[PDB]
Design an enzyme around this catalytic site. Structure first.
Site, PDB file in Angstrom:
ATOM      1  N   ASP A 131       0.828  -1.207   0.000  1.00 42.99           N
ATOM      2  CA  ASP A 131       0.000   0.000   0.000  1.00 42.99           C
ATOM      3  C   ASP A 131       0.867   1.264   0.000  1.00 42.99           C
ATOM      4  OD1 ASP A 131      -2.492  -1.519   0.270  1.00 42.99           O
ATOM      5  OD2 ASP A 131      -1.928  -1.827   2.374  1.00 42.99           O
ATOM      6  N   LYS A 133       2.083   4.809  -1.026  1.00 46.66           N
ATOM      7  CA  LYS A 133       1.386   5.984  -1.552  1.00 46.66           C
ATOM      8  C   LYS A 133       2.021   7.264  -0.969  1.00 46.66           C
ATOM      9  CE  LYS A 133      -1.929   4.957   2.087  1.00 46.66           C
ATOM     10  NZ  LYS A 133      -3.335   4.648   2.464  1.00 46.66           N
ATOM     11  N   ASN A 136       2.263   7.840   2.872  1.00 47.98           N
ATOM     12  CA  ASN A 136       3.277   7.085   3.629  1.00 47.98           C
ATOM     13  C   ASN A 136       4.701   7.662   3.465  1.00 47.98           C
ATOM     14  OD1 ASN A 136       1.605   4.084   2.540  1.00 47.98           O
ATOM     15  ND2 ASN A 136       1.335   5.037   4.526  1.00 47.98           N
ATOM     16  N   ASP A 152       4.794   2.291   7.465  1.00 51.89           N
ATOM     17  CA  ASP A 152       3.884   1.141   7.313  1.00 51.89           C
ATOM     18  C   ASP A 152       4.441   0.033   6.379  1.00 51.89           C
ATOM     19  OD1 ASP A 152       2.023   2.522   8.925  1.00 51.89           O
ATOM     20  OD2 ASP A 152       0.989   3.380   7.189  1.00 51.89           O
ATOM     21  N   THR A 171      -6.297   5.349  -2.295  1.00 50.57           N
ATOM     22  CA  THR A 171      -5.503   4.115  -2.379  1.00 50.57           C
ATOM     23  C   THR A 171      -5.563   3.506  -3.790  1.00 50.57           C
ATOM     24  OG1 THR A 171      -7.321   2.712  -1.629  1.00 50.57           O
ATOM     25  CG2 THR A 171      -5.865   3.636   0.090  1.00 50.57           C
TER      26      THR A 171
END
Ligand SMILES: CC(C)(C)n1nc(Cc2c[nH]c3ccccc23)c2c(N)ncnc21
Length: 445
Positions: A131, A133, A136, A152, A171
């Site tokens: 995930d 992106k 983050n 993360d 997302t």
């Protein structure tokens, strides 16, 4: 197993991240500040067993890279997980890019070279993000020349992703196509970085749409073009790296290690014109995402506030012995803690929160102030987001802009149009109060 509250104390809420809230905590002996992600076991389901999570956490603690977040400790109780790591005050990467006046391929190359160096390191240790992106990509410090820390890494492998739209904002743009079909490996992080590189040099996502399912439809098809005026000022090697990073078949796709040796990364790090059209598009994009997020968090806060307002009133009704509608200061702490116990930092912070309400403020008046203080962050963030989105300071947001905001928030076109009319002026634009009233009507108020 050790207890988290015995070692740390909560200072302030930093924000909301994937799988939980992030609290600024401080060690009670050494005084070391740490950013602790609190994952609720009820709201977040585990994909793996306890022994697999403990073994990954143990590895993650020993890992160290300047472009990866540092994890220090891990705790667990009956209903929570406490991931303790390093604090970064620089904020999100995109929030810094919208404030600066000039941005070029040299800035984008230095940014992606760091992200690739972090991903390459985590791939060698068999850890995948999944995930990745812009949300983050935090900056280590407030200075302009600061390292980018990826957050993360490896959580998606051990925790189930949320199905709530307030947690899935933005997302679908960066998710790899192989992740949607089930079979995927570490190459999904190169695609996500490829999508970020695409947005850094243009400011418009390659796979775009008016809603979540329309964005995923373009991603699944995997087709994109460099057919915009902003791509004329960009070099051909920048496009070649994007073409290699956004290759549909993951086996044919470039690795994170080989992406660093590319002609674009080697030339632009070791003429460079400013990409002015891309800054305005990143500014327009970032604002749209943050307002759509604030709209959903505002609607979510009003539902949980109304749910907790009746719950706290029912607890204080039973505690009222004679029935005068009043309670002692020590009694209000027992009832306010009972509300926290029923709905999932410690007793000292709970007692301090009750004293903070009593300094300003009948138990009915106590709930009115206490519950408004819980929503104070979501109400102010919505107005601040609406003001930032309204870049021309006209005070209004047009219907085309509402469709884009509600489109990103997954609110159906026919639903918000019926709510808009329940404002009969037909102006085709709404102010903050009118926009706020629509969100209130969209969450049963
Ligand atoms: C979402 C915000 C921007 C509030 N945030 N998120 C984090 C990431 C984070 C904080 N603690 C973690 C534990 C495991 C995995 C990720 C994290 C983080 C951090 N380190 N320092 C300052 N702010 C942070």
């Amino acid at each position: 197993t050790a207890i988290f509250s015995d070692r740390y104390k909560g200072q302030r809420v930093l924000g909301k991240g994937s799988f939980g809230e992030v609290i600024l905590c401080k060690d009670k002996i050494t005084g070391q500040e740490c950013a602790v992600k609190v994952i609720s076991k009820r709201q977040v389901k585990q994909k793996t067993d306890k022994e697999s999570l403990l073994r990954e956490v143990q590895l993650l603690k020993q890992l160290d890279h300047p472009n990866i977040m540092k994890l220090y400790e891990f705790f667990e109780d009956k209903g929570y997980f406490y991931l303790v790591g390093e604090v970064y005050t620089g904020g999100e990467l995109f929030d810094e890019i919208i404030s600066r006046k000039r941005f070029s391929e040299v800035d984008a190359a230095r940014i992606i070279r760091q992200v690739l160096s972090g991903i390459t390191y985590m791939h060698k240790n068999k850890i995948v993000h999944r995930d990745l992106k812009p949300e983050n990509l935090l900056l280590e410090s407030k200075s302009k020349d600061a390292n980018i820390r990826i957050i993360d890494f490896g959580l998606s492998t051990h925790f189930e992703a949320s199905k709530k739209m307030k947690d899935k904002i933005g997302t679908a743009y960066y998710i790899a196509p192989e992740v949607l079909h089930g079979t995927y490996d570490e190459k999904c992080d190169v695609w996500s970085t490829g999508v970020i590189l695409y947005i850094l040099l243009s400011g418009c996502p390659p796979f775009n749409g008016a809603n979540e399912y329309d964005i995923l439809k373009k991603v699944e098809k995997g087709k994109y073009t460099f057919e915009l005026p902003q791509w004329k000022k960009v070099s051909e090697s920048a496009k070649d790296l994007i073409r290699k990073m956004l290759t549909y078949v993951p086996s044919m796709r470039i690795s994170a290690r080989d992406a660093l040796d590319h002609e674009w990364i080697q030339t632009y790090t070791k003429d460079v014109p400013s990409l002015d059209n891309a800054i305005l598009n990143i500014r327009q994009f970032q604002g749209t995402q943050k307002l759509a997020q604030a709209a959903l968090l505002y609607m979510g806060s009003k539902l949980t506030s109304q749910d907790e307002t009746k719950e706290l009133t029912a607890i204080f009704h039973k505690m009222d012995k004679n029935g005068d509608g009043q309670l002692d200061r020590a009694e209000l702490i027992e009832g306010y803690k009972e509300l926290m116990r029923m709905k999932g930092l410690d007793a000292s912070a709970v007692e301090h929160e009750v004293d903070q309400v009593l300094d300003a403020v009948e138990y009915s008046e106590f709930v009115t102030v206490a519950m408004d203080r819980k929503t104070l962050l979501s109400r102010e963030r919505l107005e601040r987001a609406f003001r930032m989105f309204d870049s021309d300071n006209s005070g209004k947001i047009s219907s085309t802009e509402l469709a884009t905001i509600f489109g990103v928030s997954d609110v159906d076109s026919e639903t918000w149009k019926s709510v808009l009319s329940e404002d009969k002026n037909n102006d085709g634009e709404v102010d903050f109060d009118e926009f706020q009233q629509m969100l209130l009507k969209l969450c049963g108020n």
